[PDB]
């Protein structure tokens, strides 16, 4: 279970070199925006119970046959399990944004998730939507362009970290397809 400092060394044991002066500038551009990364990951976890519940209920609104009899989010037991699942997806992407490396999401969450949904009949065409709702809601809370909850930040550029957490939602939507 790696982080972004533990990616440059597992690319360098294969060459068995010392990590010298040339590739150390890529991690000095990690601790430049380290407080920018810490300010960005705090905004997701402060809005996380609203980000899930707006996402799953909008999936019901965009696809109204899900709560028909026979639907996948039909009864109260099934509706609690989809809200349980979207909590775990938003928790594991926020682990990846803090570490700066997708190897917390792809092992602990994405191993076997494609085969489990087809074994349970969970349809992936709605879960590609409900992951992609909170993908677009996460870049609002990072770049402060949300409609409600203008959070307090410092004035700069955060559009690289908003696109970097877009790529972790591309790693979710590739694997459950």
């Amino acid at each position: 279970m790696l982080d972004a400092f533990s990616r440059v060394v597992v690319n360098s044991d294969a060459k068995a070199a010392y990590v010298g002066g040339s590739d150390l500038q890529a991690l000095k551009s990690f601790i430049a925006d380290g407080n920018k990364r810490l300010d960005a990951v705090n905004s997701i976890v402060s809005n996380a119970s609203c980000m899930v519940s707006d996402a799953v209920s909008g999936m019901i609104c965009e696809n109204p046959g899900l709560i028909s009899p026979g639907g996948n989010c039909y009864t109260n037991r099934r509706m609690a399990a989809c809200l349980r699942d979207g909590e775990i997806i938003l928790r594991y992407v926020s682990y990846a944004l803090l570490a700066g490396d997708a190897s917390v999401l792809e092992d602990r969450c994405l191993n076997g998730l494609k085969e489990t949904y087809i074994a349970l009949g969970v349809p992936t065409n709605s879960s590609i939507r409900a992951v992609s709702i909170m993908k677009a809601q996460a870049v609002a809370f990072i770049t402060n362009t949300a409609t409600e909850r203008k959070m307090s930040f410092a004035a700069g550029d955060c559009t690289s970290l908003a696109s970097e957490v877009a790529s972790y939602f591309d790693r979710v939507g590739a694997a459950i397809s």
């Binding site: 279970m1 092992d107 191993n111 076997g112 998730l113 085969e115 489990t116």
Partner: protein, 248 residues
């Protein structure tokens, strides 16, 4: 099923990443790697053995059960392979009584104490039909092991809140101790043996040593006796408007 001690005052239970890795067709599990692996093996060694403090020339005989565990990532098969070892029968079978061996199987493999004499005598009914391996695989392949631990987590002492007998919580607290406590300190001699076969309970100071930090460990003892009198018939009266009614 609320249990105010469990994830509040204790830690979280250790184990493998998920149970969905078995349905993954290009792997067997989220591959932990040998820093994330051996610190889980440190928690199986501290739980199946007590704090036995196994040496370097005693772990070399358990070389084969770890080498299977780091490929087949099942925790239940690792616990089954460690209970049929020589290092499990030379500590808990060789110099002990029969109900001392049985009461440590409930500690090491279930995290609870035995609830009955009828449940305890059925484990000696399995000793007569297959020895000690029939006791161990019947605990491991039980329904109670499946719906608490499974293949995923180490079998830990779980504060449940909704125990099927209240006495089951008492015998769990006598069996585990503090963290500076192993299970060789008695010379054989099962601690729970008198209370299972008679039907009485345990001693309050022996249970409150094993409680966590922050749970009033010992207070509440009146300076009179610690158990109940079964032959006593007290008069407990209720006030109505006119007098006092002894609905006995």
């Amino acid at each position: 099923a609320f249990s105010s001690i469990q994830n509040v005052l204790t830690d979280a239970p250790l184990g493998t990443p998920s149970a969905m890795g078995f349905l993954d067709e290009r792997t067997e599990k989220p591959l932990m790697g040998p820093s994330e692996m051996d610190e889980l093996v440190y928690a199986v060694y501290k739980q199946v053995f007590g704090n036995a403090h196994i040496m370097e020339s005693e772990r070399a005989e358990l070389r084969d059960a770890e080498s299977l565990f780091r490929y087949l990532r099942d925790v239940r098969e690792f616990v089954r392979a460690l209970a049929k070892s020589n290092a499990y029968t030379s500590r808990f079978l060789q110099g002990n009584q029969q109900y001392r061996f049985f009461e440590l199987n409930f500690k090491h493999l279930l995290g609870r104490g035995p609830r009955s004499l009828e449940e305890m005598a059925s484990h000696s009914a399995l000793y007569a039909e297959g020895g000690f391996e029939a006791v161990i695989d019947a605990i491991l392949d039980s329904d109670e092991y499946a719906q608490e631990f499974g293949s995923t987590v180490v079998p830990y002492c779980r504060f449940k809140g909704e125990y099927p007998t209240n006495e089951e919580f008492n015998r769990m607290l006598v069996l585990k101790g503090a963290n500076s406590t192993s299970d060789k300190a008695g010379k054989g001699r099962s601690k729970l043996c008198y209370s299972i076969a008679a039907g009485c309970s345990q001693n309050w100071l022996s249970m409150s040593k094993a409680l966590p930090f922050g749970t009033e460990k010992g207070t509440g003892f009146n300076l009179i006796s610690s158990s109940r009198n079964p032959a006593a018939r007290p008069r407990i009266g209720t006030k109505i408007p006119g007098g006092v009614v002894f609905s006995s």
